[PDB]
Design an enzyme around this catalytic site. Sequence first.
Site, PDB file in Angstrom:
ATOM      1  N   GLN B  24       0.822  -1.218   0.000  1.00 39.27           N
ATOM      2  CA  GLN B  24       0.000   0.000   0.000  1.00 39.27           C
ATOM      3  C   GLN B  24       0.857   1.271   0.000  1.00 39.27           C
ATOM      4  OE1 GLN B  24      -1.578  -1.114   4.222  1.00 39.27           O
ATOM      5  NE2 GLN B  24      -1.839   1.130   4.159  1.00 39.27           N
ATOM      6  N   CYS B  30      -5.277   0.311   3.491  1.00 38.53           N
ATOM      7  CA  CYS B  30      -5.237  -1.110   3.893  1.00 38.53           C
ATOM      8  C   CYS B  30      -6.591  -1.786   3.658  1.00 38.53           C
ATOM      9  CB  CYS B  30      -4.829  -1.252   5.350  1.00 38.53           C
ATOM     10  SG  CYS B  30      -5.941  -0.443   6.507  1.00 38.53           S
ATOM     11  N   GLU B  55      -7.351  -2.273  -6.040  1.00 36.07           N
ATOM     12  CA  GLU B  55      -7.551  -1.479  -4.825  1.00 36.07           C
ATOM     13  C   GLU B  55      -7.854  -0.017  -5.184  1.00 36.07           C
ATOM     14  OE1 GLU B  55      -4.605  -3.241  -5.348  1.00 36.07           O
ATOM     15  OE2 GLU B  55      -5.377  -5.011  -4.241  1.00 36.07           O
ATOM     16  N   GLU B 102      -9.632  10.995  -8.912  1.00 35.31           N
ATOM     17  CA  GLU B 102     -11.020  10.790  -9.301  1.00 35.31           C
ATOM     18  C   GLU B 102     -11.219   9.376  -9.846  1.00 35.31           C
ATOM     19  OE1 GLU B 102     -12.157  12.729 -13.471  1.00 35.31           O
ATOM     20  OE2 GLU B 102     -10.280  13.514 -12.679  1.00 35.31           O
ATOM     21  N   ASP B 119     -20.642 -11.074   7.923  1.00 34.02           N
ATOM     22  CA  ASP B 119     -19.756 -10.975   9.079  1.00 34.02           C
ATOM     23  C   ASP B 119     -19.552 -12.338   9.677  1.00 34.02           C
ATOM     24  OD1 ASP B 119     -19.718  -8.259   8.789  1.00 34.02           O
ATOM     25  OD2 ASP B 119     -21.123  -7.872  10.424  1.00 34.02           O
ATOM     26  N   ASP B 165      -7.399  -0.535  13.819  1.00 33.39           N
ATOM     27  CA  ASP B 165      -6.932   0.546  12.941  1.00 33.39           C
ATOM     28  C   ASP B 165      -6.319   0.099  11.612  1.00 33.39           C
ATOM     29  OD1 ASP B 165      -4.479  -0.421  13.744  1.00 33.39           O
ATOM     30  OD2 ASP B 165      -4.038   1.206  15.118  1.00 33.39           O
ATOM     31  N   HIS B 166      -6.332  -1.208  11.351  1.00 36.33           N
ATOM     32  CA  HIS B 166      -5.707  -1.769  10.159  1.00 36.33           C
ATOM     33  C   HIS B 166      -6.548  -2.924   9.680  1.00 36.33           C
ATOM     34  CE1 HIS B 166      -2.568  -2.401   7.299  1.00 36.33           C
ATOM     35  NE2 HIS B 166      -2.071  -3.497   7.844  1.00 36.33           N
ATOM     36  N   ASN B 188      -0.485  -9.366   4.956  1.00 32.98           N
ATOM     37  CA  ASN B 188      -0.469  -7.911   5.105  1.00 32.98           C
ATOM     38  C   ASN B 188      -0.294  -7.254   3.723  1.00 32.98           C
ATOM     39  OD1 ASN B 188      -0.467  -5.399   6.393  1.00 32.98           O
ATOM     40  ND2 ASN B 188       0.913  -6.084   8.061  1.00 32.98           N
TER      41      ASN B 188
END
Lengths: 75, 223
Positions: B24, B30, B55, B102, B119, B165-166, B188
């Site tokens: 990334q 992420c 991505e 954009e 989930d 947070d990731h 990762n």
Amino acid sequence: WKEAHFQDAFSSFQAMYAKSYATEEEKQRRYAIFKNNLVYIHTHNQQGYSYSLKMNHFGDLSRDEFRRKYLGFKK
Amino acid sequence: VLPSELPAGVDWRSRGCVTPVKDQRDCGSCWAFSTTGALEGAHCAKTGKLVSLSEQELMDCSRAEGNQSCSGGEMNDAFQYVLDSGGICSEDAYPYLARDEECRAQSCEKVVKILGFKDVPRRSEAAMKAALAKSPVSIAIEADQMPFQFYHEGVFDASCGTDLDHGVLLVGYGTDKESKKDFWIMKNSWGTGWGRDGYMYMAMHKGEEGQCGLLLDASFPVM
Ligand SMILES: [Cl-]
Ligand SMILES: [Cl-]
């Protein structure tokens, strides 16, 4: 380690990751962060954990800088 | 559902359903990598075909669903976009720039589509294993601590926070005879120079929240 060891280690880090710095103030900050992380890694790896650490391209970032820009999950 | 009915190990990598490790770089993207990895794995699990996905499309085009490109986002909002927009383009078609721009999703063919997303039932290792038996799973974790930043290899059983947070991907599970510890296989998006060629073996038995909170907000695409 002496300062010269840290200085050599930082030059190798700069070469390996093509890290350059636009001001002498930034370089001195990044050197200090790098040294702190290097000491952390080395100390950690003497402590007998189940996992090891290794220097990498995040070597000149503090936790705050790492968190703010290199992660990205926001609920 | 019975644990005996689950395999001893799962590794989608050796089944051929995981793209090479991506990076990334200096962009809070992420969430997009976790999403594409789950979609790559789910599509391959179903069809046997591995297609690397975009991505950048997610970053550029999913702001309506709540994501904010390099300023951060979440996997479910991204799955919602894929559902909303009729699918996702390939990595080759819409490559990764690690910068805000954009949307150009009119510029490429949607190659992978989903029916919806689910989930994983919360706070259950058994539920996570069952989901992983089916395909890779998107997870959220706290990943900002120093041991995480500099992780190299071995089972990561560090004392971990749960401030999520990731966003990353689990691609399986197994057991390590070296440390005598069960693990999840995590992929990762920090390149192959981080961790074990880009991967982390995370300790399996770290309570109901999962190691670094990995059981708190896990999900996957349905195809
Ligand atoms: Cl310099
Ligand atoms: Cl820390």
